[PDB]
Amino acid sequence: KTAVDSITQKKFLCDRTLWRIPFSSNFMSMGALTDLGQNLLYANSAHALD
């Protein structure tokens, strides 16, 4: 009943793992050779990445 005015600190820890961002059009693993690796934009031309 004598508690202080508080604020909540939220965080997470996620050990041992890699933050994977798949190069797929729906972010799903439908195959090892993804549908954007077979995309003719990324297959027939050279593009910069930043």
Added chain:
Amino acid sequence: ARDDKLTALLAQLDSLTRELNVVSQQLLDLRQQVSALKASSP
């Protein structure tokens, strides 16, 4: 007065501490961003 006068300080000190709790968050954000540019700079 005494009653209406006391409500003149509860309608201005709340207006200033709402303007001071936003500029304190904004200054704490921009301090952490100057420390970002000083670190990346040679």
Added chain:
Amino acid sequence: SSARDDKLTALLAQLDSLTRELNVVSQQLLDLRQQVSA
């Protein structure tokens, strides 16, 4: 680029005092607001 880092590390040291001298005003304003409440 040594002449330009002094302009930034002096700006960090004076935003240090600015967020500290504002921090004592934000604690003295909630003192005299709750002083009116009594």
Added chain:
Amino acid sequence: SARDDKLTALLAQLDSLTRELNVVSQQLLDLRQQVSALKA
């Protein structure tokens, strides 16, 4: 050049702003010791 001048000119403000906020806290110590000395 002008970027370093804007870095220099804000420090004239950031020292004049922490000097005002120094005496801002000096006038609010006056207020909390005046309202306390009027109710009793």
Added chain:
Amino acid sequence: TARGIVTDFAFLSPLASSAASRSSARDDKLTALLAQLDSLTRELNVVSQQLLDLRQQVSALKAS
């Protein structure tokens, strides 16, 4: 003694090919901070106008 001439060199070695593309991106951010910081001193001055008027006003109004 021989640490910080080739342990800061082998550290910052991938960032050497982009030393001009990143210098203009920090030129972008620094000219964007100092305009957000100038306008922050515009608000804190006009807040402090209202924050010091209540010494002159209320001391002749509380104690009257």
Added chain:
Amino acid sequence: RQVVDDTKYKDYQQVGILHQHNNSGFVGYLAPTMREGQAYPANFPYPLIG
């Protein structure tokens, strides 16, 4: 336009309309009435040139 800066200009004094005396003795004070006052160097506005 350019106005004066109350944060950078060292000798800034906020002078309201009661105390601005440009055209001091050749212009009626706070009114379209008859002139009043003496000739005197002005204090308003601050110079933006020179």
Added chain:
Amino acid sequence: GLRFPSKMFGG
């Protein structure tokens, strides 16, 4: 061209 009608006063 030659099909444009001639200028007269009021018509």
Added chain:
Amino acid sequence: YMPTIKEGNSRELMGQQSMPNRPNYIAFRDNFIGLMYYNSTGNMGVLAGQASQLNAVVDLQDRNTELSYQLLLDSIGDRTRYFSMWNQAVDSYDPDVRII
């Protein structure tokens, strides 16, 4: 009118008379002439591909890109109008001042 060459206050300096300075309008030029190096072979601009690296801007000294752009805006648009984005405000003397 300075009556007295001597410094310091005197009765003769009540007769000194003050004239306003001449109005001097300093600004960027019409359509931002003078900012960009055109037709300087020492400062020729580049629009090229990143890979072939052959500049498609062949710029010459006896070309006048500024005056080509000033005369183009007269033909395709109303030139008396003002446009602040390209600073398109044509230099125009006063007709009562030039011809009295």
Added chain:
Amino acid sequence: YMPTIKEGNSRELMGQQSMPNRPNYIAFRDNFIGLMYYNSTGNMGVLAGQ
């Protein structure tokens, strides 16, 4: 070697020591490189019929 920061003659300027300037060979380049504008699209030369 200047023994004294101050100017004017002194006993200490008997100890100042001379060294010859470095040899600098200023000349036209080999085969007159840099006289003629080759490979300049803005300063290109002409051999044409009249």
Added chain:
Amino acid sequence: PTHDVTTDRSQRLTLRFIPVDREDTAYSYKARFTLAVGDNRVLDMASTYF
């Protein structure tokens, strides 16, 4: 017209280009950009400015 006029993908109307290699001098200023026109796009250079 509805179809085959405006794209159904995401695309910025206006882009912002930071210089790649800027160079400051007392008498001039040089700025080197990457004017990267993305695929399935056309850029009229009249719409470009500094």
Added chain:
Amino acid sequence: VDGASIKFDSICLYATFFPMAHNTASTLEAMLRNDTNDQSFNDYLSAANM
């Protein structure tokens, strides 16, 4: 002599893009890569300056 001075903070290149449909802007792209569809321009002054 009169103390005027210009300085540059940062110069950015902007580019406004018409959001053309992706297989309309690729049909236009394919047509404009011919040598028969080269974009030919003329200087409005069209003069040599002496």
Added chain:
Amino acid sequence: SKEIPTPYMWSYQPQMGLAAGAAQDYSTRINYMSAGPHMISRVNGIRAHRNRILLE
């Protein structure tokens, strides 16, 4: 340009094993902007004799 065009040379993709896409042979062009009719007509007969070989 329409009668005697420049051939679209195909870009290969060694991974998919298909052709990427064909652009015109801009990089093997021959510059007769300093030639006259005694030699522009002789180069245009070589642009056209090449196009007969590629159809063959």
Added chain:
Amino acid sequence: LYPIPANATNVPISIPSRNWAAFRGWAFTRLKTKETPSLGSGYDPYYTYSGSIPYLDGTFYLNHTFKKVAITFDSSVSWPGNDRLLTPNEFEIKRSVDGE
């Protein structure tokens, strides 16, 4: 391995130009320079550390220190684009300030 200085926040990396065919995706994790040897070289004489090496054994632990990720192709086009995400221009991993 891209270097991050002490108290540094942004890590701008850049690929010049490449055919991106058969690209599977990304996978990123922050490391420490003290805890990562300069491999490729046969002997690192400035490697004064003998703990777990997260570069080699998968003992990654600085995953929580990521704020956001912005991926742009061809210096102009944001990825994935197409308004896929709730903030479509970037991969916001965590937020300190959340009002929405």
Added chain:
Amino acid sequence: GSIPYLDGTFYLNHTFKKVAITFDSSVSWPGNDRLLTPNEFEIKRSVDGE
């Protein structure tokens, strides 16, 4: 006086900061990363850092 609702003498156009149009309580209009600030129509600014 002049009724701007009836005669078209509108004069308070400059007092707008921004407009946020969201269709169907979820989809921001125009969406599509169209604008430099794509979630709303920023009409004017006080803080202009970028």
Added chain:
Amino acid sequence: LYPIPANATNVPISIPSRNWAAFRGWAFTRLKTKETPSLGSGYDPYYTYS
């Protein structure tokens, strides 16, 4: 001439897509930006080297 920044180790270059008919080979040598004038331009004001 491909630029190499200071203390840069690996320099990738690219040639977009091209008929390589009658190609003979490569030859290459590192230069210095201080020693090499910016040719193509008819004058180099940034060239403080002789």
Added chain:
Amino acid sequence: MTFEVDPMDEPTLLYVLFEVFDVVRVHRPHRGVIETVYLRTPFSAGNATT
């Protein structure tokens, strides 16, 4: 050409426009490739193909 002008008490210039056909034909055959051919007649700088 011979110009008879009024005498002025100042060094003046004579700006003659020798009107030509300053034409540029622009070819973009592949992604990233920008080829231009310049021709002005009569006062030819020459065959400024790029």
Added chain:
Amino acid sequence: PRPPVEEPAVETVSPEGRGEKRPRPDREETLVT
């Protein structure tokens, strides 16, 4: 109210009424739109 139009349907802008250099004033000859 509307620029001049040919009808080949398709709807084609007609070039009539445009301004030209003339040795004689164009209002006494044609209508200029």
Added chain:
Amino acid sequence: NFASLAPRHGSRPFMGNWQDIGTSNMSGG
């Protein structure tokens, strides 16, 4: 024939003119 790219005035496309595709703008001629 790219007539679905033209704004329909009525039921027909408002195509432009053939002769408007080029330019002849030049100072003095």
